[PDB]
Symmetry: D2
Subunit: 386 residues, 4 copies
């Protein structure tokens, strides 16, 4: 019955199940959760691990003895449960000092503090076992056109990430960075707003091999984009270092619904792609149990994230295994798409009369693609109606 186990590599942020329910129109509906309790409860649900922002684990402004005690308690819970910490990140968005950004704040002193706050937490992440360090620049951007020179900001962003790469290299760490794009919210427009913009930026870093993306389902959908397509481009580029799973109903505020909610068909095609491609990273849920829920509803929502992934994994596997689907894929020429267009080379293509002077455009145009029957087989499999 679709029970998750640690082999599935499902992970959750402390800030997910720990979200107290504050929204901009509403006060908290749930009391604060001790990270120790979250580790224990998530382990009981079959999770593989947890993730954290610095400020989720160590209250901002803590002394060293407070910091040590908070980390000690968390480590003890990890050791007790066997839960891993595959990824961590920096909170460079909540505190008022970051109201104009961290790495791209107009004020240089804030930019430097943001880097120092990040570097301190990279050390802690490595200590606790993280393989990926995520950066979500939620405050990098603007509400008005004059407030941020984006060319200068990209220079500052490159400088920051280059320094972080120099740091991890100098320390001999194996951890790598994953940039998490988002188009807007909390800023009117956020810099590096989609997977594409982040991938493009990475190519201009000094050590691009150290950086990939951490795409989030709902974020790309807030720009109306096809999340499986974006993941495909990230995989094509060798840059899918981590992924954030949740649900979103199209173009509106960032809903962070449990995975499977929002665009269910997109969730199906996403799981099909991750499993087919052999993605081996964490299946991380960056979601919020709605503020209508008590703690029983928190754990039900987290359990649902994993359950929906596993149902979709079964259905996508059954789809790909079905001989009738394999036939429909051939009927739609998915096999031909994987063949090189012109491995014979440019000169041969130019000399091939069948490619132009003798090409029967009307006969080619008459061929149906058979995509509707293929998609109805996919629907039948998703719904278990085969």
């Amino acid at each position: 019955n679709y029970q998750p186990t640690p082999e599935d590599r499902f992970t959750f942020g402390l800030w997910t199940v720990g979200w107290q329910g504050r929204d901009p129109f509403g006060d908290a509906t749930r009391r604060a959760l001790d990270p120790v309790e979250s580790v224990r409860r998530l382990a009981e649900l079959g999770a593989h691990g947890v993730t954290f922002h610095d400020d989720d684990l160590i209250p901002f402004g803590s002394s060293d003895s407070e910091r040590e005690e908070h980390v000690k308690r968390f480590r003890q819970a990890l050791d007790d449960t066997g839960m891993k910490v595959p990824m961590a990140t920096t909170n460079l968005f909540t505190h008022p000092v970051f109201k104009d950004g961290g790495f791209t704040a107009n004020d240089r002193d804030v930019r430097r503090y943001a880097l120092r706050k990040t570097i301190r937490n990279i050390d802690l992440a490595v200590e606790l076992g993280a393989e990926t360090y995520v950066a979500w620049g939620g405050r990098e951007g603007a509400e008005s056109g004059g407030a941020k020179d984006v060319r200068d900001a990209l220079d500052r962003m490159k400088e920051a990430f280059d320094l972080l790469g120099e740091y991890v290299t100098s320390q001999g760490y194996d951890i790598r960075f994953a940039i998490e794009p988002k188009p807007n919210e909390p800023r009117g427009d956020i810099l590096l707003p989609t997977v594409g913009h982040a991938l493009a930026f990475i190519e201009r870093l000094e050590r691009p091999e150290l950086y990939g993306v951490n795409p989030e389902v709902g974020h790309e959908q807030m720009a109306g984009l096809n999340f499986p397509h974006g993941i495909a481009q990230a995989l094509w580029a060798g840059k899918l270092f981590h992924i954030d799973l949740n649900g979103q109903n199209g173009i509106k505020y960032d809903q962070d619904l449990r995975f499977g909610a929002g665009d269910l068909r997109a969730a199906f095609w996403l799981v099909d792609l991750l499993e087919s491609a052999g993605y081996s990273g964490p299946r991380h849920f960056d979601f919020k149990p709605p503020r209508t829920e008590d703690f029983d509803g928190v754990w039900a929502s987290a359990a649902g994230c994993m359950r929906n992934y596993l149902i979709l994994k079964e259905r996508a596997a059954a789809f790909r295994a079905d001989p009738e689907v394999q036939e429909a894929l051939r009927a739609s020429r998915l096999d031909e798409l994987a063949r090189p267009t012109a491995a014979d080379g440019l000169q041969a293509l130019l000399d091939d009369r069948s490619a132009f002077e003798e090409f029967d455009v009307d006969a080619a145009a008459a061929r149906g693609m058979a995509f509707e029957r293929l998609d109805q087989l996919a629907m039948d499999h998703l719904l278990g109606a085969r």
Copy 2:
């Protein structure tokens, strides 16, 4: 009185002023326009040049004789007016043969034909003096998840662009390519849906220096994105080879309104950025006079494109030259954003107590950004209400 001159480098596609008004729910409302007339009338309006798809200039399926005559008549009009042809492109979207794409059609024979059709028109573009060859892959994509393996499609897209780069290099042509992103329409989702995705793809081509972007105002806005921000990233990357100017009311079908319509404030910030950055390429309008209009309205709409650019250029220049605006920019620390964050280097940053232990977080947080006064100065300048 905001009169365009050819030195402004305003250009128009033949298919813009020549759009006959067919939409998916409506038949054509205007008769066909002779390209010769378009050249002459656009010259009278102060345009610098025109652009074309192959099939706009030469009816699809024309004999070599008919093709020569169509080109000859067009060249005579260019020669008589001094009008230029700075850009050309291929129609790989109208004919039914391209219903599943050109370079990424599932059928391999179609992919080879698309390349041959493109190569033939590159030759014609060079004959006419085009400096940029645009590719808008409007049929590259899918309506359903199983129809298109996006990793394979990106392989085919790269193969195609690599072959085109080999062709131009082998022939010694100075022309360069510009990929035009669009998120959707006519396909449910289009491959390379935004400026970011196209920039990222270009970095993986064999000869990336031959390829840039041709972003279109309305296309990025169909994903709810900030067009000036995207242009800034293209400029930062050295990839703004060409630009398409029009208007769009947010997230809906591609409207192709005249430039200045749609998001007027975004148009202001775009013109400010292009002029401030010293962009020297064509200011090309890919717009459609609404089908409500007769030909007097066609030419009025084309004139309006250029007029609005020039008004916005004046207001943006006045904004930048106003000492009160410059003071506001300094108050908001836009000048400080241009200073390197840590040119002192990583070790110095790590050793700098002013960047962490002695950083006064609450004093920094108390500093206002003064962005609202700056933005109201921008509004006052845009509206001529200073």
Copy 3:
């Protein structure tokens, strides 16, 4: 195996399976279908009936003998198959004369012609058995703010609909009108853009009982709205006279995907609502088989519309029948929502100290809503994973 039969009341527009594939960037990919063939093929698939615009059945500009022969052939096909015609409509959008609208064209002569064209087709619709006459005002609206005075346009729209109501009343017809809202496309903004605006307008007609709505899944979703919620308000108002079923991926051009595609979860909740409420009207599909398809794909796509409705009907029925769901609905207080708030009346409510002075806000606030477990039961049922 989810086979449709005529008892299911599935209907299709001639223009759906008959769409030749022309889009604004592409020429037709399929030859024209004879309505006689469409009637026969749809009957073979298990449809209950067909619908038409005047211009789908009778080419615009036909003589009376041509009109009679076209109607005769269509009637013979209806008689041969037993297919019904439950609804018909007027094409007031394709021909260039309607480029500024029909009933709200600025030109009064066009407004009067639009009414005469509609009235002629009302007579034909009644002859062929239609119970509903749909009006989709796809050209009523504007691309620019000055082009249409919306207060005047609403006066003209009310006048037109009032005259149509006078006509049907004077003739003694039982047919009723259903206004089909759409937010945009082909006009930049369309008048009466959502179910709400149409419902509000109807209340100001002279004989409001003669008018309801014909909401379309994709149209409300083009404004990002919740289609089941809109249908609920239409049912609450007694105004769901007809419905158009299809799929849409959120906020973009009108995709007209087959029903079940697009927002699958919304399709589930829609079918649950229609079946629970006892909606007895046609389940009409206003969709377009993608232009990638040949005619085998056309019929597969139409069959898929019906199949998906039937799968969702089974899953929603199983959801409502499940004792565990009935328990979850109680846990979430859906039963309490159906109870009057204050059937004791205003004075009793004002005098009830338990409603205010003695109301324990913190105890009430602590109660979880249990909505996540309820929604995961719904997901499990939709996916057949119970």
Copy 4:
């Protein structure tokens, strides 16, 4: 120089200039503002009045003594400045007790409490002189399909508004209600999501004359709708009792930018419509100075709201008074749109050969609308470039 005066009837909510800057990813950036200071500073800026939620003026849970003192201090500031309070509203969204709604909470006890809390504040509103009592049901709705039976919820919403209408009638109060639609946020979908849905609902209330709409610029734009068009329908219905002015960049989270920001052209057409129609109600700003700002920026942003309204009023008046614009309006037949279509009556229309058999369709279709020249005149006027 576009200086506001109290006779302009500009008003502001206490919660606007008093927003402390908490967003869902960020803590407050500004300290709390005393309502007395807001009254005095807004008066100095030229405002006419202020508005309030109960909980903005009186901390939730205050004793009767504390409540009296808070109101007394506020009234003293109003009396000292001559500032008015034209509108008031209830906070039925912040406290956790309202997490599933007020009037449509599933729990019946919460619905009764919400009504009592509202009624208490209606009394206070009357004491302070409010002519309109706004209801923004920000928590009425759902994140999941099973959580909220929308027909039952509309029954509960109608019951609540009917009881409130009975209350004001029984007390002899002249105050009227204005329902503020919003499509989403903080709920995944909000009930009565647009102006249209609210207008439709009002027509089914027991005393519809007591209820109108309070539309908000940004809210309709969050559904991609045309705000001036929606206001036109509200005016056509006699239901524009109040209006909320701000800015929004299309389809994303509710930005509450200062008026004139966001869609500047829509702001122009809105001001044109309100002034042309003779709207006499408050011009109320429901906006938030961005959290980047200090208090100097707060007051600059508030001043900017009024300044932009006044600039746009000037430009719209100049547009309407320009004989060249009036000529363009006639050329586009805006005057003809005001003529009744068929005041001659149904029979005369049916008998009029000029409306059908002798209507020259091709001559009518050939007439251009001249909308582009008209819109460029509007652009020129907006930008002061005539």
